[PDB]
Amino acid sequence: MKAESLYGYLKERGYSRTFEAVNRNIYLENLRKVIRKAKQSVGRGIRSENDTVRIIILDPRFPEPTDLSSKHRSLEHIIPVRFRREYRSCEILSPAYFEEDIQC
Amino acid sequence: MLNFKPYRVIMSSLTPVVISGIAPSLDGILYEALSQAIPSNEPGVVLARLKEILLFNDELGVFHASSLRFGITPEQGIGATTSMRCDYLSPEKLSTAMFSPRTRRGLFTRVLLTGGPTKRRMTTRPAYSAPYLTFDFVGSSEAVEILLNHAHVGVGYDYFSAANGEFNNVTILPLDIDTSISNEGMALRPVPVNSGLNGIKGVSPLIPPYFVGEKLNIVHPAPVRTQLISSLLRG
Amino acid sequence: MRTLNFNGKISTLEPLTVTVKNAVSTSGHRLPRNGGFNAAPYFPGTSIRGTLRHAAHKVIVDRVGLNADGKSPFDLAEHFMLAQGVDINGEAETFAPGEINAGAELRSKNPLISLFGRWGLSGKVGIGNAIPDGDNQWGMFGGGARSIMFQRDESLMEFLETDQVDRLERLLEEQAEASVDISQIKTEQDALKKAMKSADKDTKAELQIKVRELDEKIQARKDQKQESRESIRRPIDPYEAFITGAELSHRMSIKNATDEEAGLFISALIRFAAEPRFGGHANHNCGLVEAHWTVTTWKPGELVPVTLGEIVITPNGVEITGDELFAMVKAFNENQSFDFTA
Amino acid sequence: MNHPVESVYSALTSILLPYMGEPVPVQRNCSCCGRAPSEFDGVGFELVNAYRERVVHCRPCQTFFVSAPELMGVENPKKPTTGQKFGMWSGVGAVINVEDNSSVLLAPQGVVNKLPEHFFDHVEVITATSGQHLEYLFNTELKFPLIYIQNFGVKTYELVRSLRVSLSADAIYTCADQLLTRQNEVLYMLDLKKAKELHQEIKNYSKKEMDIFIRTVTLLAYSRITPEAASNEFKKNNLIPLLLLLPTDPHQRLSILHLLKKV
Amino acid sequence: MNTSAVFESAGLSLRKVQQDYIEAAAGALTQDHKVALISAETGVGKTLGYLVPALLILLKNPEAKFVIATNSHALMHQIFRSDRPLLEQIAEQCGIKVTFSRLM
Numbered sequence A: 001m002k003a004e005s006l007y008g009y010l011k012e013r014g015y016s017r018t019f020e021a022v023n024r025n026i027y028l029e030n031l032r033k034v035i036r037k038a039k040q041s042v043g044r045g046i047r048s049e050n051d052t053v054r055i056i057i058l059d060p061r062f063p064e065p066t067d068l069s070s071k072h073r074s075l076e077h078i079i080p081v082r083f084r085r086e087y088r089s090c091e092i093l094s095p096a097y098f099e100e101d102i103q104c
Numbered sequence B: 001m002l003n004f005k006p007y008r009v010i011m012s013s014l015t016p017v018v019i020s021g022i023a024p025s026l027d028g029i030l031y032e033a034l035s036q037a038i039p040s041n042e043p044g045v046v047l048a049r050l051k052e053i054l055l056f057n058d059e060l061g062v063f064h065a066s067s068l069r070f071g072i073t074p075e076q077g078i079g080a081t082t083s084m085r086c087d088y089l090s091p092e093k094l095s096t097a098m099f100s101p102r103t104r105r106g107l108f109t110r111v112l113l114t115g116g117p118t119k120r121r122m123t124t125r126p127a128y129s130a131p132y133l134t135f136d137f138v139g140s141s142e143a144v145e146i147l148l149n150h151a152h153v154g155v156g157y158d159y160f161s162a163a164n165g166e167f168n169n170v171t172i173l174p175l176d177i178d179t180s181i182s183n184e185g186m187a188l189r190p191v192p193v194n195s196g197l198n199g200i201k202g203v204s205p206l207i208p209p210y211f212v213g214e215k216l217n218i219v220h221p222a223p224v225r226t227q228l229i230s231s232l233l234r235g
Numbered sequence C: 001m002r003t004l005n006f007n008g009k010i011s012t013l014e015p016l017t018v019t020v021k022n023a024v025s026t027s028g029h030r031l032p033r034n035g036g037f038n039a040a041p042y043f044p045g046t047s048i049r050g051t052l053r054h055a056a057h058k059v060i061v062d063r064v065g066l067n068a069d070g071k072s073p074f075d076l077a078e079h080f081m082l083a084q085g086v087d088i089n090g091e092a093e094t095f096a097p098g099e100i101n102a103g104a105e106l107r108s109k110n111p112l113i114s115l116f117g118r119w120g121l122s123g124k125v126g127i128g129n130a131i132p133d134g135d136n137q138w139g140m141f142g143g144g145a146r147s148i149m150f151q152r153d154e155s156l157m158e159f160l161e162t163d164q165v166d167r168l169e170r171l172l173e174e175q176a177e178a179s180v181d182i183s184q185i186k187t188e189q190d191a192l193k194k195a196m197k198s199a200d201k202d203t204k205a206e207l208q209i210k211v212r213e214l215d216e217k218i219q220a221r222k223d224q225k226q227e228s229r230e231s232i233r234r235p236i237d238p239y240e241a242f243i244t245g246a247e248l249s250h251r252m253s254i255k256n257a258t259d260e261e262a263g264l265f266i267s268a269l270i271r272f273a274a275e276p277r278f279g280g281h282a283n284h285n286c287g288l289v290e291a292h293w294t295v296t297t298w299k300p301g302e303l304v305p306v307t308l309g310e311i312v313i314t315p316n317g318v319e320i321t322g323d324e325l326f327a328m329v330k331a332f333n334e335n336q337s338f339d340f341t342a
Numbered sequence D: 001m002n003h004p005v006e007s008v009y010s011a012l013t014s015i016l017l018p019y020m021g022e023p024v025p026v027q028r029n030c031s032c033c034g035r036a037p038s039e040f041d042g043v044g045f046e047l048v049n050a051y052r053e054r055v056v057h058c059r060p061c062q063t064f065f066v067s068a069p070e071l072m073g074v075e076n077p078k079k080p081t082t083g084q085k086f087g088m089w090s091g092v093g094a095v096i097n098v099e100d101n102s103s104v105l106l107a108p109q110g111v112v113n114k115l116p117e118h119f120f121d122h123v124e125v126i127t128a129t130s131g132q133h134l135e136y137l138f139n140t141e142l143k144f145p146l147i148y149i150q151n152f153g154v155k156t157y158e159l160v161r162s163l164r165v166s167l168s169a170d171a172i173y174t175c176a177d178q179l180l181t182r183q184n185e186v187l188y189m190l191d192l193k194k195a196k197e198l199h200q201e202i203k204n205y206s207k208k209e210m211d212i213f214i215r216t217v218t219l220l221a222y223s224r225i226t227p228e229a230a231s232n233e234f235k236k237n238n239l240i241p242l243l244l245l246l247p248t249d250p251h252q253r254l255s256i257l258h259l260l261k262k263v
Numbered sequence E: 001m002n003t004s005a006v007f008e009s010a011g012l013s014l015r016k017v018q019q020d021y022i023e024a025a026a027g028a029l030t031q032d033h034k035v036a037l038i039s040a041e042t043g044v045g046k047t048l049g050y051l052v053p054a055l056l057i058l059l060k061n062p063e064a065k066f067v068i069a070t071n072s073h074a075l076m077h078q079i080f081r082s083d084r085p086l087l088e089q090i091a092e093q094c095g096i097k098v099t100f101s102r103l104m
């Protein structure tokens, strides 16, 4: 309905955009809201300079470091920039394609 | 003069990359990006500003900017696609509203598009379609991020004209060892023959732009190098 | 001089498609994917570049106008120079190969040949690809089938004369027999192709000189049709396009461009907004786009993007925002000393 | 003198020496090859092409436009008085040994039929179609440096500007009448050495394993199968050494595979 | 000016990121009728990151105030739980006043 309301608003404003385009826009805005919310969630850890946190994301949809083309790649921004190296070197509980290809 | 740290840049390839025999060096991409940023095509000033964002080997005469290396994932690999350019003489182009053809019997002499100096040029070039492109370089991460994200620069022969090798999602990660010039004695970019690095012989200018300057003998890596994206993100 | 980066989004008003020989295969019409089938297609920047170059050339034609005789002053040589940069008469300033900033006289005199290059003169406008901003934004559009008019609307037969009615019946009979012959020939071809994947070199050579002869048999049978060479009741193959309302990230730029060249580019974009069509299949109104391009520039010396304005093409109009964009447009409108005839 | 077109002219197209006539002093570079007049000794052949363009062709370049029906036979019976031209042959190639200055012509059977007897006396011709050029190159002991033209074609200018001496079997430059830019020499560069070693070592693999390897590599080079799938196919079929001997470049992979399935 | 000395000389273990955030906040507050949007991840320090700019701008035109709105009820304590003496010392170094107001 938020998509419907925005579509009606843009339609009355004269903007010509399909309903699915408004759905995509609302989905991207919701995804950014989700990124912020999980940034807040992660911020619950490391409240002091000496604090050490093991952050464990059990969601299958969280982008793997090697899967740079994942749909929710923006979720990598959940990890603070300073710890992005630690994002690259992370224990994967169930990695996919966990073999050694020969066409290197 | 700025503190330079070895960084690896990985970007998502969006269009096929056309390699002009020698693999595109990130120094060339950055040179084009600066030529856009500084409204000047003079090689001297663009190079002087490029040295401020890239580490330059005086003893070797090149920038610390590894050549193109295709990051291939287990999903998509290096693919062979033809960058395909055709003249499209539409009816609007072929109309008296746009020019005055020579007339005989009141009929307009049609343009011979099947050949000759006015043909439909079907220029096809090879291009390598990998899911990612990667370079290594000893330079400022901020400036290169800004340039690659905002400057109109791609990887390959003509990003400007053909829009080949469009990339996005430019991600920089720090490295532990400078892998721009050498890699266990294997040159990862064009270097002079006397540097002692093995690879493939070629002729090209050491410093960009690679279409000016005397073409002196150099050693360059394989034009098409592929590495697993997981191995590239290891650092 | 200034570098104007037009970073923006193209929202597709009606499906956006393009035919590329490498992308197009016998399996069907696919967009350039830069990889396998399970990859993200991109609208070529070559197509957008050619469309905008044609728009700019039309703008130049209008600015120049027509001779006293009502004919365009451009000849074939000049027309092709401005359209596609092919020197047909062999008369062009052969600039030095190593001197980058060559043709400043030509660049000033011919802003079109400045923005887009000619053969031997690097163009100033870099037109990037339109990259979709989603994972499902393309589809097999068009398709459908050509239906015989008289087999759908019986009323249309009331207009045909009995001789033409018999002609129609003969056409349908020929179509039926040609279908039932070509289908069997293609089945034999399919069997031969199935045997192509278990053959050795010798039998391969024997059984591929056979496939082309079956194709020639197909062509001869189609030629034998007295009333219609090609079947009219044809199922149209779909073409791959971007969905309606696809937000495609588009990256354009002009490099170290005088205000007049940028003005010509903006005028070309404004003219393009009259018929904002990219790609083919215009029969299905494909290509209609509305785009908003934030026009940025680089700070002198500093690597920071300043926002000089915005270019919003929509069916309701072209919105130029930013004083400097108007300045460039008027500057191009001024400086009447441009010389497109040499 | 020391340019690619001169060698092929001396080795192959000198047969029509009688059929040009004397040169003409010129003051502009040869439009066909493009090099400077300083290496023409100031002489050249003026000509007008089918597009009504005044073009200067030097001694080795003008031979591609000479009509010698009494030597080169008739190319199109509708026009008897214009025989086969070196610059108009499509599907015909040649291999020119520069140091020996000899030439072998790889023409299809139709062209060989059209050629008279007198032609063979000056140039040795072996019947081979467009696809059989690679068979001759692979099977016969080539002698380097050599100029390997693959398609004389009709774009003579691009042909001459694409000629490149093949100094050794590691890199044989095919001249297919398409302008040999630095972007597209990968499609015109043939590594007979790597193809030869791969063919030598392919004998150890079954025909089924061979077909599997070729199809997997072709699909991978065309991005029709995921790299994990191709790796699984190679590992299951024990095709690892073959991949190790392939170039990383997918276009070169396709070229050498095309060569392999021809020999 | 007093910016460089008063941070380190006061004994605060200020970091470079703290300096950058403080300078950005001060410069933004210098501009009139605009809006400043700065992201400040945990660790940079917001309690003192923006309040020191407020004091520095207080030194000039000392006839204004600075509301500091914090949503969380615990953070309003945090402004005056263990940093009120710190900001008071900073004011003593800079020299003029704090004049806190714990509004609820």
Ligand SMILES: [Zn+2]
Binding pocket: D005, D030, D031, D032, D033, D034, D035, D057, D058, D059, D060, D061, D062
């Ligand atoms: Zn010549």
